[PDB]
Structure 1
Amino acid sequence: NVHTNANVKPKADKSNPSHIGAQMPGSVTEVKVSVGETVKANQPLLITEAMKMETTIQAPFDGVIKQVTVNNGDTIATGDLLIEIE
């Protein structure tokens, strides 16, 4: 592509605790976890930039990251799947 800004992300299924969805339209500023990792509850796994403002996305529980749908500097839309955990 030349970067990954054209990439369409699947929508997170809302009634599945494994699926973490994008809460706002933002930009992925920093990816912090990869496929097959295990960190504690509240682990800062993704850093988005909403609109000049920055929030870390945290894990709701303990578990193993199955998929990360995004890369650094990627645009996101409300309801976009970002992370899946076990």
Structure 2
Amino acid sequence: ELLEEEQQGPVTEQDIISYVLYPKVYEQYIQTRNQYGNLSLLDTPTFFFGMRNGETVEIEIDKGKRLIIKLETISEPDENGNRTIYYAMNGQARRIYIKDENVHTNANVKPKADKSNPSHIGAQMPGSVTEVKVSVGETVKANQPLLITEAMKMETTIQAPFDGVIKQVTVNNGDTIATGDLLIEIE
């Protein structure tokens, strides 16, 4: 009764004692199974290492059923540190997003600001983010400091041009910024 409630429906006798015997471990197996599918079908080198640029791999799903996957390119991380993997699965173009566990988010590429859009605040010159003062969905006054950045041992706070609400903040503390990088959006 418990397992069928949690999962979709079908549960075997083998599922039941697997739980009883290893409750937390079985429940983890299911979480991974729901996230990634059947990993036991992967060849071991792929299971431990993934794929290198340009590599083609085969996954035997069953008699006459297999996945031909090619890894084309891995993009640079966006402002969130999400890399875009370019794939080819069974002759179909494919794009997958994976979060990178950086350490310091100085590899993140921020989109350029639209200079004609008054909502868009762009970085005046190159630096590093010292202190973020606002978050997304916060009403701010005109002239209100909403980002402190350091240029060359020099701090220059960035302030709101008008009254409005923050739509996005593309930077966190310690992030590198380049001339023209989008940093804030306001209404």
TM-score by length of 1: 0.98
Structure 1: stretches of 5+ with no match in the other structure: none
Using the alignment, how far apart are the partners of 2:171 and 2:125 within structure 1?
Answer: 15
Structure 1 position 6, deviation (Å): 0.7
Q: Segments of 4+ in structure 1 off by > 6 A?
A: none
Match of 2:155 in 1: 54
Partner Cα distance (1:74, 1:51) in 2: 15
Residue equivalent to 1:82:
183
TM-score normalized by the length of structure 2:
0.46
Q: How many Å separate the matches in 1 of 2:131 and 2:160?
A: 16
| Alignment match, 1:16 | 117
**CA offsets 1:21-53 (integer angstroms, 9 cap, x no match):** 000001000000000001211110000001000
Query: Unpaired runs of 5+ in structure 2?
Result: 1-101
CA deviation after TM superposition for structure 1 residue 4, in Å: 1.0
Name the larger-Rg structure: 2
C-alpha RMSD over aligned residues: 0.5
Kindly state the Cα deviation for residue 19 of structure 1 after the two structures are TM-superposed.
0.2
Q: Report % sequence identity.
A: 100
- What is the CA distance between 1:3 and its match in structure 2? 2.2
Select 1:28's aligned residue among 120, 129, 136: 129
1:61-83 deviations in whole A, cap 9, x for unaligned?
00000000100011100000000
Higher relative contact order (CA 8 A, sep 6+): 1
